[PDB]
């Protein structure tokens, strides 16, 4: 949704950390807005991208795609321009019919939050553990 | 990580609960967990599909994926059987390297909940709003 | 203007009804602001959009444009979902010059509203009966 | 819509201008109705015209157009004869199906008048920002 | 960055103040802010515009572009209408890598302000004195 | 214009650094003034240059172009002579009317120094923040 500064709080393993995302403008060729960690160096700024578009004159379906891109740096090592290794992503899409109501959309999204917050997935992602 | 009955909810758009997903029917030929309301009516119900993958020589990385299915059923005139008409879906893929920490994964996980709860996404689908 | 949940009132045949148009972002490929009916049915939503460029791009004007779509819909008996059977449209274009006065522009805007109120257009539109 | 002298009020930024335009008949070669200003010089007059199209061969709907024109002129450079200088005008069209609802024909007309009063359009033509 | 009304003192030979440029939106197709003192008759108005570009195929750098638009108009010197006859402007481009720190981006920013305030540019720009 | 030793105090993101630039002169191939950072060659490379173009016989349009570059030196372990990364730079041009006054030009020169000095550019440049 609208670009502005976005604060993500109550995050990390303890659920106590915060991250502030500065907005970045929209690339009209794909309709993608971007936000990133409000740090000094882009090479290591965690990124969030939006996306979010109306049903097309082909197959309809309201669709979104939301990405998380999280880089890390090491010693450098020996470089004055530190190398970057991506450690992790998320790529979340949604698809809704043109007749979909607010509650269908809200439940798919808040179910995802409720589900990721379930120990089944908390542990599966923190561990990279299949559920059994 | 561990299969358990999932009684998710509290925050639909109206502050209502959505349940219950029974983690039963795990697919043994791809190792994919199956969470569902489908136990009552498999043709017309809500499901969550959960998979985790370990690295091999053809990828050398880790994957976590959750698929959310929320079909809506209706009985058309002349039918004695409701069928799915309107539908809503979501699909999230996460990916990690072998040097990825649990702390970074927790950030990707918790940042996503923060994003799902944040106006950045509770507008993007609910108000059908692109980033303006 | 800034997209807002715009409420119109004193509208329709008796001049007594209302309509709420919610922000749906702007189209990023042409910078056109868009609102649509608040009710959650994208398939059949009423739409209003606004374009306000200046002469640089086309070395001309640029005329201000407002687009209106009213996709009148009806549910066939026995259908689970309504569809558009008739549509009404409007395209309102106003002149602009980089050297024009804001008062001149207001004169035309308000003149149009006064004309829409005038019986000459009430018949040109309600009957589809052009002036004679 | 019989042409009659129109005496409009509520015109301009503060709604304090009025405008009176007298019938000049209808041009039967294109079906265009016209109301004139009492000024002597055609190039210097304010005027309104009306035209409605119809379904026909290669035409699917009725198109209702009103032309609003308000030239601005002055005795530039000391001229004994004033001239335009500025063209403040609007091309406003509506279109309807032959099976359309009269209530809806009224709504698009009245919705536009309501939209014209609303910040959404008053700034769009009198003084608006790109979009936003 | 986030738009605000900008109140700039110390402008011109005597340090005349205050020049006030209000946030009068952002062009959605290219991220361009438009600041202005009034905007009623744009040709005759003073403006500053700003955008930030991201790297893409073609260029690996991040860019910040600021443009200053200050046309000078003549009053209605018998013409009965003011117009632009002379103009000054600036087109200011900054470019940075993914490894640039904020500290460094700021040197280019503050060095330029410090240089603009220095005799080398006071003479190069105000008297158009040649290099020597 | 005329070259002198230039000291730029109160620079960088905290406004605390002082830079001393030693003029070298004007390169006769293109008439471009140059100021070098007053140390080792890799530091000297962090040059500021000025091109003052008098209105051309075939264009008129005076132009003053200021180029700022700041390559960052880095020596690898086992190396001596550092390589540099052109992490940050700018290219700024002032123009154009041959009939403009020193005040019109000073207005633009100082307007930019005042903008570079303002929160919008402090953030637009130091953290690459968009017009949000």
Numbering used by the authors:
A (entry chain M), B (entry chain C), C (entry chain D), D (entry chain N), E (entry chain E), F (entry chain O): 1 to 132
Sentences from the paper on this structure:
The coat proteins (CPs) of single-stranded RNA bacteriophages (ssRNA phages) directly assemble around the genomic RNA (gRNA) to form a near-icosahedral capsid with a single maturation protein (Mat) that binds the gRNA and interacts with the retractile pilus during infection of the host. Like many other viruses, the CPs of ssRNA phages can also assemble into virus-like particles (VLPs), which are not infectious. Through a native infection without engineering the amino acid sequences, we found that Qβ CP can form diverse VLP capsids, including the T = 3 icosahedral, T = 4 icosahedral, prolate, oblate, and a small prolate form elongated along the 3-fold axis.
The elongated faces of the small prolate consist of two triangulation numbers, Q1 = 2 and Q2 = 3. For the prolate VLP, there are three types of hexamers. The “normal arched” type, which comes from the prolate, oblate, small prolate, and regular T = 3 capsids, has a θ angle of ~155°. Interestingly, the hexamer located on the equator of the prolate capsid has an arch angle of ~180°, which is defined as a “straight” type. The same procedure can be repeated to generate a prolate capsid from a T = 3 capsid. One can even repeatedly add hexamers in a multiplication of five in the middle of the prolate to obtain the rod-like VLP particles previously engineered.
